[model samples]
Target: GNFSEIESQGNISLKFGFLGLGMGGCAIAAECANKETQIKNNKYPYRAILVNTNSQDFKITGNVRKIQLEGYVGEEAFVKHETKIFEAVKQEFEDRDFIWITCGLGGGTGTGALLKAIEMLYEHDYNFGLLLTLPRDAEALKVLENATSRIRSIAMNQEAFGSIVLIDNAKLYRKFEEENPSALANEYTSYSNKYIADALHEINLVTSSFTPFSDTHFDASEFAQVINTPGVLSLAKLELKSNQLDTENPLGYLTQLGNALEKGVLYDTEREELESAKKSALSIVTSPLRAGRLYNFSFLNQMENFLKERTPYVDERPIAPYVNKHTTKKEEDIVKFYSVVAGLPLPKRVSDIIDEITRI
Candidate 1:
């Protein structure tokens, strides 16, 4: 009945895709899909495919495709099935511009199969990034060893991927307990996965949109550049009160900013990791009314200066102002800052993991 309308309105540009390897990757992929549908009025623009050696791990459901390695027991046998992995990746993500390959290290499938997946992506000449989760200390020693060795290997071949985001399970567990004391144990994985998904979604949304009255714009290309810097990455989001931007108390505001930077990071990175950043991007978002108030051009300048001082290694920092047109009365006075820093070395927690393993 509506043939002409259907024929002409379906053209879409899918900029990002996700390949989830093993059970951990599948969970995160499902969360990403949930987030996409939640935000986009049930329309999902990002492609997601879940791959695992075990069939039972496919129970988590969402707007995702799943590929189960029929005869494989673990990643060690993945080489024999390399062609299948390559086919799945190509069939799902051939048209997408960038792909984010996610998995939890220290597991059988994810840890063992990750390198082969990377190889396939390289052969296909697809731009890809990695979202890897490190296991907690409480896990078995074999798990710890697997994660440590995999991370070291990834570090050596860092230049091949666009960016690498690492989330430590120990830090995530600690943070979750502090925030949600009464939360159930089973909820932790979902919470962590949702956090990772939401961070990337917010970043993709902001950078892809155009904003007015911005001298410097942080667009998708710059976001790509930051993530493509071939190092560890961290994303932080901070909400500020109107009084926090008082120019009279510059140090006061700076101190508050510093604390938020430390507390609000998606991946709890050390100060040393922050200092080692080679690329960084900061975006200031607020209502038009708030933009005219204390969160004006002057405050933007101050924030940029603070970032410059905090991350001296970055050759040039990109800061953009985004005016939120749909700010409600409750949010009109609130200013949100989103920061992404890339090209960082592994965090100290990794060293601690290594030390503990050695002691044992």
Candidate 2:
């Protein structure tokens, strides 16, 4: 098969659409699509829909269209005007392989419209991917409460989503704490929204490129397979430490790998069965100096073994590792590994978020 373009089998054109659910969702998609355009030096492949109450301020692009639900009042407008909302972006959702619904979940506009949009998409037999977000700790307790119920709503309609990727405003705060210790909560939310956008941008970069990263390539289907299950999607890139390369410290290295994974994971549950995922695309990226020496077959085998033992029903054969030379620079002392895993359960942090709301 040609890896150059990710096309569905036969004559089916792999068309994708990106729709921003509300203010937060609109910004995330706008950021993602803008970065993609800047990098590619032109318009991106997918069509974009900006659905919001006031759609005037956002910078309009050639491919990005808008749906103004200005007159609709509150959350009820989303459900009450379901048919109108669906018709507004009917063409965007029409005959597409996947439509990514990007939104901030706790708020009324995005959360309200999410399920209804998915219902309409289901009627069209199209699978939609969710890029959803949770509220920050500093926000109103009501925000977290609202987000939890929405999460439950999504879980019940799991089949409606082709994939689910969650963003935590609070987690993003911790991830980049060194830069700003005293920024406003709204500023932190913006930072987190951009971080989520950046994450999606990287995924687009790795998966859509022409040359396969290795003899064992990572395909979009592999990604789809992970999200196809009843769990959330998690991704992270790990840069191997200089002193931590010793084969004797396999557990240590794995621990760091797990940390990176946890940093980006969402919707995880308490049970190990829910936390552990099956199919994974682990790409090994190394610098020119240590390109060949970084990931020895034995070490790679060990990592695969660890995953197999920990995760239930991990395939008998480990996935082929993808190696890239571009990511690691000459002076860098680390080899990077980017992994995408699916079929795992939700994480405790999410439960903790809900718990906080209850306590507050």
Candidate 3:
């Protein structure tokens, strides 16, 4: 009955910690920490640590905190050092409100160590999430088998984690190759790692930067609810020109929104998985001039209706309109929509990878 008092408290920023499991995880965690420092005027908001069986992999992460699994010779040996690994994680992230365990699910270090780390975190009852990378199809059959098995086990007990974000390396590689056919291998790796970091960073920034001047606000509590829903989560965003919001054909904007939800997702998610979302958030970030256009009931209703039609089961759908006064003249004519959905089944891409492994 006193819900309005709680709503009046406004937005509260959540503390996030990133625990990178191996080479791939370390690269992404470094990127995320670097991005945070770069954007926040050298103030890093999140705690980050890189863990690995080999010290050589730590070379790429620069000054970030690192924990090397001593006495471990190879990836397979990482499991034997779970006590050390869990101790490092606990020491670095125990005070954090939420921790994200980032790992590439294939090779021995990331896969094996991640399994042990998960068990420790569960035993300790730490609130955490997962950011897992699926190996590319071009990788060795053994790698694919490792990845498939890890994903199967993770999916079986998916409810244990707060959220699971799956990234497909093959899909990212193909997208990058289409843009620059001659790009080097390291370039592709850098691009993929940066994209994952940037996607999560942008979403977190948007959700946390809430202002009362706007018609609606997708605050931190709602985001926490979505992430804590315990299922597959996907993020998608698209930038569109102001002309796309034509009054003569309002459906055009909705069409673009539909495409953004389906095709622009950062991970490989199917229509069925999206339909299973139980909680979702839609935010429109635009210049002050364009904010008024989106604040109206009709336009907002159309967007809400679009999501309702597609994800009928979503128990909570919050549409937030955010104004960016710093937009330049050119940017004033653009609008960006950031969409997030949670509580969905494991992506179909995992099954595809399993099938591919079977054939191999």
Candidate 4:
């Protein structure tokens, strides 16, 4: 039985393996500790660990010590510092059946040690769950691009490691925004974590109203229906609606994609405008860049389904999408929408990510 649905059978144990010292690591730990507080008979979650790599007596400004008192561990991100962490989990999960590991990915240590860590879990034959986080805005702002690039490096390996839940802080930094420009960079840390805590726990409690298992393996486009996450379609519509999207332009369109593209969004037309619209658009808000790629496949299948019922194939192309996450209080984990914006410009990075799955 999949551990996510194992709420009934045995002790649905979750071994939260945390890696990182900054905002991402602390936020998830705190949230899980918070969630566990609410459950009356929540026997599924057993152990949780947090890793810090300062090597010195860094104060618990990041919520480590606080969450620790709730039966969570505050360890070191480095292998040498976390002797107890390595020992406790290594032996516990060495043969334990069901397990879940959460972390702040895309950095020096976690990304570097992920394959090995999972190999350990695999060797123990543990079933796992991964809720991976990106850097909080301004916290690792300077290093975000380098961090994001590495997720794709293991792009192929994600499926091998249980379910991969991507919670991105770049929700604003990556895609163009239609509103809430100023509050995003500052407020996203808490909101993103809360958004994700619900995504996992809520669906686990509610059961997906849309698809099978709620896994990434959406075999075809017809298989997708609206779930809970409202930001999915929001991303697709907003990006293409922008006009002043050029690689060389300096003002930076936060309402659009961020430097995760590093290259920029695409813009064509002799003159750049601030508000042009595309007649038709497509929404493919996916995680890692592979989902973004396969999105094209599912979307194309959706388009084919539509065309077969209506007129002949006029144009096979769909417009672009803008990606986003949010700061609401509810725990609705699923992403919503299959709709698109009318007409809009595609950012260069978004174009590149999506273009791989498209053809001439």
Which residue pairs of candidate 2 clash?
Answer: 267-346, 267-347, 268-346, 268-347, 269-346, 269-347, 274-345
The lDDT per prediction is 0.71, 0.59, 0.71, 0.36
* Model 3 CA lDDT for position 108: 45
Instruction: Give per-model TM-scores.
Output: 0.86, 0.77, 0.84, 0.42
Measured with C-alpha atoms, the lDDT of residue 179 in candidate 1 is 83
List, residue by residue over 157-242, the lDDT tens digit for candidate 3: 77887888778787788888987799987789888987787677667766765343354677677777777778878888889888
Q: Residue 280 of model 1: what lDDT?
A: 90
**Per model, how many backbone clashes are there?**
0, 7, 0, 29
Candidate 3 segments whose C-alpha is farther than 4 A from its true place: 1-12, 36-42, 61-63, 71-79, 138-150, 179-182, 210-215, 352-360
On TM-score, the stronger of 1 and 3 is: 1
CA lDDT for candidate 2: 0.59
- Give per-residue CA lDDT, model 4, range 1-360, as digits (tens): 122322332222233333323335545655554454223355433334455444232232221232121222222233343445456566544433334455664343344345444545556555554455544344452332443233333444544544444445555244323344556555555555555554444333322112222233222221111111111111121223123322235235332322212121111221121123222223333223222343354444543444233222223323223222221223122222232212223334423433443431
Candidate 4 Cα misplacement greater than 4 A, ranges:
1-23, 36-39, 43-47, 55-77, 81-83, 90-100, 105-110, 135-153, 172-186, 208-360
lDDT of 1 by residue, 1-360 (tens): 111221222222226778888788878877776543333332565678877766664768334677777653255656777777677776777667778888776654544477777767877788988888877754642564654255445556788887888877777888778989999988899788877776676677667543545668777778878877788888888887776788777887678667766654557766766878899988887888878775466777778888988788999998888777766789888987778888887666555665555555
Model 2 residue runs over 4 Å out of place are: 1-16, 37-46, 55-60, 72-75, 79-84, 93-97, 110-112, 138-153, 182-186, 208-215, 241-243, 265-278, 316-319, 327-333, 347-360
Model 2 clash number: 7
Worst 10 residues of 4 by lDDT: 226-235
Q: Candidate 2, residues 1-360: lDDT per residue as tens digits? A: 121222221111234567787877887776655543333333355567777775455453456667677663145566665666677567555644567788776565544467666666678676677777766644543554564245445555675556677777666767657667777755765676567755665555555432343466555665455545445767777777656766786778888876766565333223364236655566555554554565566777787775565555656323445434443254356666667766555456555664555565
